[PDB]
Design a protein around this nucleic acid. Sequence first.
DNA 1: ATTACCGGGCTCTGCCATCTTA
DNA 2: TAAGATGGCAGAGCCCGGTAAT
Length: 324
Amino acid sequence: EDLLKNLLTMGVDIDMARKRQPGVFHRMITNEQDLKMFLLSKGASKEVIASIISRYPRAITRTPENLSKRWDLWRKIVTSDLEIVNILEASPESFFRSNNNLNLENNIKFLYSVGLTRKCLCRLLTNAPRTFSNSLDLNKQMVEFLQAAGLSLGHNDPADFVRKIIFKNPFILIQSTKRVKANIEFLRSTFNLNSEELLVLICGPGAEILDLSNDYARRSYANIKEKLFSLGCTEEEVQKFVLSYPDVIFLAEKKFNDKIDCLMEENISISQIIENPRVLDSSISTLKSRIKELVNAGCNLSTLNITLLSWSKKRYEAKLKKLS
DNA sequence: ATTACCGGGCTCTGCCATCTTA
DNA sequence: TAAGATGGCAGAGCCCGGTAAT
């Protein structure tokens, strides 16, 4: 009865909430008052609280003890109340979609038992909070899968391959083993690729390739291949290009294409680009903005060393002064 | 004095489908 | 037998500067 009214004064988007979890609006008891007071107690703003509830209404069904207990468990990982408030604003659901504080505590123990430092748990929690709402068994599967994958290739100690990969790729525990498997086979298939090279790639520059959704890597690579082929790059040149800079796989087709075109329209050859792949780091705005500045001064661009297009503001802007 | 090489910083959902559970 | 709990999916970069090399 009082529910709909309280939510209103709280500032909640009631229509959106209703549509997200209608089941919660058919409960005869709810704790929206306790929740609001609880989150206020911990620093949250009035609008954040409304936003949280609007996106994950079931939040209002937790008790002060559950909330406080779960919070205190998050405080075993993150050092301050404010850090947790920010994570909850950014995704409420990782905190509130489970009321199983025992599982949570077991997750924490299991992760520690994998040999992860607190700083690494903190990095997980802050950037992939949903790791902590996974069931223990779910996090176990991924770790097991990774060990198995580690030794299925040539890794001298899998236990340490796991830590390297989890530190470099903090999102790995919230991907399915299906997705990750498929991205590893994509890499092994498309490139060479001996286990030793595949390890390095996977632990290092290619680490987040493992988090790409189904077929998105294959599709993105296909586009890179087409686009470079069309410009007179051989397949070997294309592979070498992508392995030297796997981040290029993350770009959307159009973004990669527009980036290439915007450079070559200034007479930068494809060869200049693929031999200095880091120029593709800059956004299109930054590239266009810098190109204008440089042509707008003496510069050729066809013969210039284009590495500067991806330098820091400070280093770029200094070289530009000198150039005039 | 200037560029290259290379790794690190920041990275934090919101939905639906399919079970459990009471 | 309806909610709650859980798994799983699409989504689609940019920037900085330490330190080696020249």
